[PDB]
Amino acid sequence: NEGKALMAIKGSFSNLVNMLLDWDDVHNSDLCSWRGVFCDNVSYSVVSLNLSSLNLGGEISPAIGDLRNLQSIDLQGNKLAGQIPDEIGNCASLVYLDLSENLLYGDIPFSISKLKQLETLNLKNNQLTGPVPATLTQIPNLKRLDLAGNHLTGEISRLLYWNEVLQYLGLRGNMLTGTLSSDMCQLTGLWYFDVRGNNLTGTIPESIGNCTSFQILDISYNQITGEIPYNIGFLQVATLSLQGNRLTGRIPEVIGLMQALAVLDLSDNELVGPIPPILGNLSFTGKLYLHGNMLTGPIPSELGNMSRLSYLQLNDNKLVGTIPPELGKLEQLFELNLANNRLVGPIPSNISSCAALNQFNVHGNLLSGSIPLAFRNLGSLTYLNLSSNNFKGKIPVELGHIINLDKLDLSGNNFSGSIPLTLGDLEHLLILNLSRNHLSGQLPAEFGNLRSIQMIDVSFNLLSGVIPTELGQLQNLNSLILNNNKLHGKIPDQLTNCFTLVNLNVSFNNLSGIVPPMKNFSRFAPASFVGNPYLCGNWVGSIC
C-alpha cells in the first residue's frame, strides 16, 4: 500500500539508472530502510522523504499524496519537471516542503493551503508562473516562504503582510508588479524581507520605521521612486539594500544612528547632495556601497572612523577634493573603489596602513603627484587601477614586489623614466596596461617571465629599442599592443610561438623588415602595421 506509492514515485522519475536500486517492493521487504525514506518507529509509516541532489529527472508523481503521514519532503536538485501535483495537499501532517532547484512549472497549487501544519514552503529556483495567491495567508504556522528564482506575476496583495509568525519572505527574482504597502510593517515576526529583482513601482512607505523586527531589508533593483523616508532610521536592520532603484533626494542623516547596520547599499540610484559625515559613527558596518549616484563634496574623513569597514565603493559619483589620509585608519579595508570622480591631489601615503587592502581603483579622477613608496607595503594588493589620471614620476621598482598583482593599469597618466625590470617578475599578472604615458627606454625583455600574462599594452609612449624577442615565451598572451612608440628593428619571428596571440598592434613605430608567418595573421586589424616607414608588407603606406 505504501510501497505501492513509493514505487509510483520511483516510476515517475527518469534517470534512475543505478539510483534507487534499493526501491524494490519484492526483493527488498523493508520499505523503511530504502534510500532516503524515514519511518517512525511505532507505525512504520513514511514520515520523511529526502532524495536531495540525485538528479532523478522525472516528475513528482501524485502518489506522493498517498503517504498521508509525511512530515517532511525534500526533492531538491533533481531536474524535476511537470507541475506541483495537487495531491501534496492531502499530506495533512506535512511540516517541511522543499522543491527548490528543479524545473517545476505552473501555479502554486491551491491544495498547498490545506497544509495546516506547514512551516517551510521552499520553491526556490523553478519555472513556476502565476500569482502569489492569497491562499498562502491561510497557512497558520508558515514561518518560511521562499519563492525566489521563478517567474511569478501580479502584485503583492497586502493581505500577505498580515502575519505574525512569518520569518522569511523571499520573493527575489520574479516579475512582481505593483507597490509596497504600509501594512508591510504588520509582518511583526519577520526578520528577512527580500523582494529584489522584481518590477515594483511606488515609493518606500513612510511608516517603514514600524518594521523594527527586520534584520535584512532588501528591495533593490526594482524601479522604486521617491525619497528615502526619515523613519528608515528606526529600522534595526543589519542589511539595508536599496540599490538599483530610482531613489531621489539626499541621504537621510538619521541613517548615521543605525549602529546595528552591517551592510548599507544605496548605490545605482539618483541620489544627490553630500555624503553625510555622521556615517562615521557606523562603527559596525563592513560594506558601504554609495556608487553610481550624483553625490557631491568630499570623501568625509569620518569614513576613517568606521573601524570594521572592509568594502568601500564610492565610484561613479561627483565627489571632489582630496582622498582623506584618515582612510589609513581602516586597517581591515579590503576593497577601495573611488573611480570616476573629480578627486584631487596625491594618493595619501597613510593609505599604506590598510595592510589587508586587496583592490585599489582610483580610475578617472584628477589625482596628482607620484605613487608614494609606501605602496610597497600593500602586500595583499591584487587589483591596481590608477588609470586615467595626472600622476607623474617613474613607475617604482618596488611596484614589482607586490607578488599577488594580477591586474595593473597605470594607463592615461604622465609617468616618466623606463619600465622597471621587476614588472617582469609579477608571476600571476594577467593584465598589464601601461599605455598613454611618457615612458622611455627599452621594452623590457624580462616581460618574458610573465608566465600568466594575457594582455600587454604599452602604446602611446616613447619606448625605444627593439621588440623583445622573449615575448614568444608568453603562452597566454592574446593581446600585444605596442603602437605609437619609437621601437625599431624587425618583428621577432618568435612571436609565432604565442599560441594564443589574436590581436597585435605595432603600428606607428620605426620597425623595419617583413612580418613573420603568424598563425593568426587574419585575426589582426588592417592597420596593424601602418606607419612603419621601412616595414615591407601588402598595405598602403609601406614601401612594398
Binding site: 507541475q83 505552473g106 505574525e164 526578520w191
Partner: protein
C-alpha cells in the same frame, strides 16, 4: 543616566518569576538590561516605561523567553504595567487548565496588541477584554475557548485584526460595526446563525475567513459594499442559495471559496460573476450547484483556478472554454455534463492532470 520606573520593574520581576524565568529578578535595570521580548521607552522625564512584553518561542534570529510547563502562569502583576502597548504569549503552556484572565481588562487604554496564540486557554472569553478600548490586533488562535464571542467586542472601535480561529466558539456571530477592521478570521469554530448584516458595513475588510463553522442562510446581496475585500472563504458551512444577482462591487476579490456547503442548491446565473476584474481563485465544489456552466466564467481575465467538481452540473461545456489559455486548474469532474469536450490540444497538453473531466458520462471525444 536614565533608570526604569521601580514599580514597573518589580512588576516585570514578578511577571517573569510567574512565567518560570526567575532570572529576570536579578537584573539591576530591566529596561537598560533589556532582553529580547521586553521593550522600554522613556517619557520626557528620563524615566523608562515597559511598553512591550513577549513570551514563547516565536523565534527569529533570537527567541523570546519560554515558559516552564510545570510552573508558569499569567500573573495579575501585568496590571502594574500602566503603559503596556503590546503583549505576546506564543505556545506558552501552563501546567493544567487555565482561563484567559479577566484582569487583562485592567490595563485598558495603553494596550493595542494582545496576542495569546496557542496557549491552551480554556473556558469562555472574558467579557472585560472589552475594556481594551484601543486594541488594534487581537489574536486568540487555536485555544480551547468555550461559549460565545463576547458582545463587548463592540468597543474595539479601532480594531484592525481579529483572529479567533481554531477554538470551540458557539452562538451566532455578533454584529459589530468595526470601521477599520481589515482581517476577520473566525474559521474552525462552532458558530451558527446567518451571516451578520453588519458584516457588510466593515468596509476596510480585506479578508473574511468563516470556513468550517455552522453558518446558515444566504450570502447577503450587500457584500458588494466590501470594495476592498481580497479573500472570502465560506467553505464548509450550511449556506444556501441563491448567489446575489450581482457581485460587481467586489473588486480586489482574488479568491472566493464556498466548498462543502452541501445544500447550497442554486444555479449560477450568467450575470452573477461578471465584473470581477481580479478574481483568480473560484472554488464552488461539492455544493449541489444546479444548471449549466455559465460561459461568463470564460471572460474572467485573472482567473487561474476554477473548481466545480462534485455538483449536479448538466449540459454542454461552453465552447468558449476553447479560448481560455490562462487556467492552471480546472475541475469539472463528478457532474453530469454531456457535450463534447471543447479544449484544444494546446491547453490539454499544458494542463495535463490539472484538468479534471472524469465521471461525466455524457462527455464525448
Amino acid at each position: 543616566g536614565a533608570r526604569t520606573e521601580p514599580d514597573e520593574q518589580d512588576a516585570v520581576y514578578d511577571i517573569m518569576r510567574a512565567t518560570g524565568n526567575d532570572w529576570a529578578a536579578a537584573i539591576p535595570d530591566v529596561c537598560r538590561g533589556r532582553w529580547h521580548g521586553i521593550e522600554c521607552m522613556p517619557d520626557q522625564d528620563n524615566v523608562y516605561h515597559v511598553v512591550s512584553l513577549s513570551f514563547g518561542a516565536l523565534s527569529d534570529d533570537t527567541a523570546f523567553p519560554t515558559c516552564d510547563p510545570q510552573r508558569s502562569y499569567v500573573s495579575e502583576s501585568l496590571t502594574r504595567l500602566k503603559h503596556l502597548k503590546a503583549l505576546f504569549f506564543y505556545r506558552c503552556l501552563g501546567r493544567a487548565p487555565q482561563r484567559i484572565p479577566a484582569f487583562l481588562g485592567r490595563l485598558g487604554s495603553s494596550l493595542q496588541t494582545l496576542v495569546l496564540r496557542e496557549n491552551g486557554f480554556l473556558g469562555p472569553i472574558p467579557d472585560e477584554l472589552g475594556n481594551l478600548t484601543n486594541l488594534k490586533v487581537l489574536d486568540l488562535h487555536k485555544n480551547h475557548l468555550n461559549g460565545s464571542i463576547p458582545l463587548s467586542f463592540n468597543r474595539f472601535s479601532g480594531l484592525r485584526s481579529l483572529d479567533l480561529s481554531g477554538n470551540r466558539l458557539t452562538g451566532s456571530i455578533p454584529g459589530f460595526v468595526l470601521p477599520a477592521l481589515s482581517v476577520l478570521d473566525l474559521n474552525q469554530n462552532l458558530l451558527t446563525g446567518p451571516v451578520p448584516p453588519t458584516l457588510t458595513s466593515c468596509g476596510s475588510l480585506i479578508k473574511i475567513d468563516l470556513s468550517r463553522n455552522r453558518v446558515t442562510g444566504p450570502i447577503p446581496e450587500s457584500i458588494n459594499r466590501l470594495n476592498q475585500l481580497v479573500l472570502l472563504d465560506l467553505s464548509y458551512n450550511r449556506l444556501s442559495g441563491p448567489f446575489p444577482s450581482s457581485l460587481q462591487g467586489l473588486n480586489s476579490l482574488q479568491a472566493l471559496m464556498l466548498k462543502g456547503n452541501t445544500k447550497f442548491s442554486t444555479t449560477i446565473p450568467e450575470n452573477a460573476f461578471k465584473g470581477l476584474k481580479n478574481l483568480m481563485i473560484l472554488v464552488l465544489s461539492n455544493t449541489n450547484i444546479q444548471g449549466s456552466i455559465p460561459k461568463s466564467l470564460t471572460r474572467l481575465n485573472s482567473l487561474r483556478v476554477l473548481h466545480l467538481e462534485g455538483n449536479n452540473l448538466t449540459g454542454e461545456i461552453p465552447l468558449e472554454f476553447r479560448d481560455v489559455k490562462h487556467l492552471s486548474e480546472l475541475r469539472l469532474n463528478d457532474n453530469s455534463l454531456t457535450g463534447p469536450v471543447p479544449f484544444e490540444r494546446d491547453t490539454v497538453w499544458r494542463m495535463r492532470r490539472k484538468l479534471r473531466l472524469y465521471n461525466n458520462a455524457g462527455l464525448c471525444v
